[PDB]
Design a protein around this ligand. Sequence first.
Ligand SMILES: [Mn+2]
Ligand SMILES: [Mn+2]
Ligand SMILES: [Mn+2]
Ligand SMILES: [Mn+2]
Lengths: 285, 286
Amino acid sequence: MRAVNWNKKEDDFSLMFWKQNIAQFWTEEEIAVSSDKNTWVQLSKEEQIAYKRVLGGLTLLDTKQGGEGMPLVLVHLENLQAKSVLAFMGAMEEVHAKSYSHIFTTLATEEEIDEIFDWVDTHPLLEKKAGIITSYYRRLLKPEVTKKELYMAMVASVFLESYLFYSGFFYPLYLAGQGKLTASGEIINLIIRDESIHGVFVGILAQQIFAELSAEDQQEVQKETQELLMELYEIEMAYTEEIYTSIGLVEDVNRFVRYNANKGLMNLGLEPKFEINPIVLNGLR
Amino acid sequence: MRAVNWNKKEDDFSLMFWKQNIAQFWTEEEIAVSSDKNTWVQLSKEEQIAYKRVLGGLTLLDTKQGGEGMPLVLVHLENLQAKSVLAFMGAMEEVHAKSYSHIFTTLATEEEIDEIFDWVDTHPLLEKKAGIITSYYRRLLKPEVTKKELYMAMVASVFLESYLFYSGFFYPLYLAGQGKLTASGEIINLIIRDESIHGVFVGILAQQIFAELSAEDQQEVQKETQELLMELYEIEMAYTEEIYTSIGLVEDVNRFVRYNANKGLMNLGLEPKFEEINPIVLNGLR
Ligand SMILES: [Mn+2]
Ligand SMILES: [Mn+2]
Ligand SMILES: [Mn+2]
Ligand SMILES: [Mn+2]
């Protein structure tokens, strides 16, 4: 039975990602958010509701990535150095999820917070979206998996990391780009910095597996990947309509979703399928 | 589908362990080990071989705990806050494993290191020991698991964290207690500080699951736990004989293995099954 041996590289990238993950390490106690109250109270009721809802959705996605996506993809890897990186990335998803609770503590009463999480749990689009992704992860709950199954779990993971978060990240970035909720915006920026390298890394692992598949299997997963992309897109467009119609931002968020869907495809070595908002860009500064 | 909500406690302990795991965060770059070369050369060939072999075994156990034990237990937990803690603990196992490579880079040539890892991979007792533990983890590779299966995976994990590491930890502690390889000893002490909390936490989770089982299932897993304890003990005694006979430490290590097996049992809420810590080892823990 093999032990991980870092003195003999298993690939040309795991060590750099290991070091970068650790270089980026942070926790919610580093960013105090109480000063956001002064701009929080300036938001309309509809704006506050949208913000809380998107952060609830982000919390759900990080919960599933740390508790299902990273663990189940990493248990089936043969590359022990890449497994190490994924384990750390999974822990960081739990840091991310806990940081949303830190934001909530400042922006909402205890009763308001539990209402957010009840809304998350009973929400049909969030259930459908998370169910589609986790179906690929739960396919790995068996002793022997195929490379097509592992590849598609990695595709699902890249799509979560590089694409499904972004209908939610839009709004904290959009507000922070205007000087509103900038401390929470700093947290979201730290989260994004992590998700960006998560998506690149899992996409490298996916491309390595893809190269080992037969031509027939390659065709099959290419079709599944394109179909998954567009299945998620239809759900995202329903989600942005539900969240953002009240505040007039639906088409802006949709443009942002498509930009990030293209980045997810590129992380997998695939061509873009869709043809950044300048305020969001200022929030990423 | 539920998202983790830290503003409503799911249990009385996960937040405390979350905070403590983070308070204890470290990486290998924080302890330079080059100064250990001066005492490494004072050791005999047999002492150096023993040290490299036990660190190889430790690396294997951490590799399996980070890559199988924590992930598969955490997947099946319903408590999202406890899942969060286990994910962080699993990442720390990978930090631990990488820290052994950091020690090796100072103490061995590239060829000597590859020899260590070849020895680990082909070693029959390490394969048997790790295979027993990971068999409990690999029972969780299915869509739905029983509480008996989850409980026994947690028992196996506590036995790894609180018991099976210690035939290996003995020697770095013994040497550090004699002023040898003290920088490496500092790393091992950081690892032990983590494993100690890992075993306590998983043991709490196991006790909670146990209390939820039917009486028939409780009787089954109680017997299986005691059998597993003693099956592992027989293997550990073969392992310590193999590693430590050449340096005259077998009975001392065995004394330390039993002390830690009792701690693992206590972490599970169970009575000790074996009859003070060696004073040199104690000085290495200071
Ligand atoms: Mn995350
Ligand atoms: Mn991520
Ligand atoms: Mn460890
Ligand atoms: Mn541990």
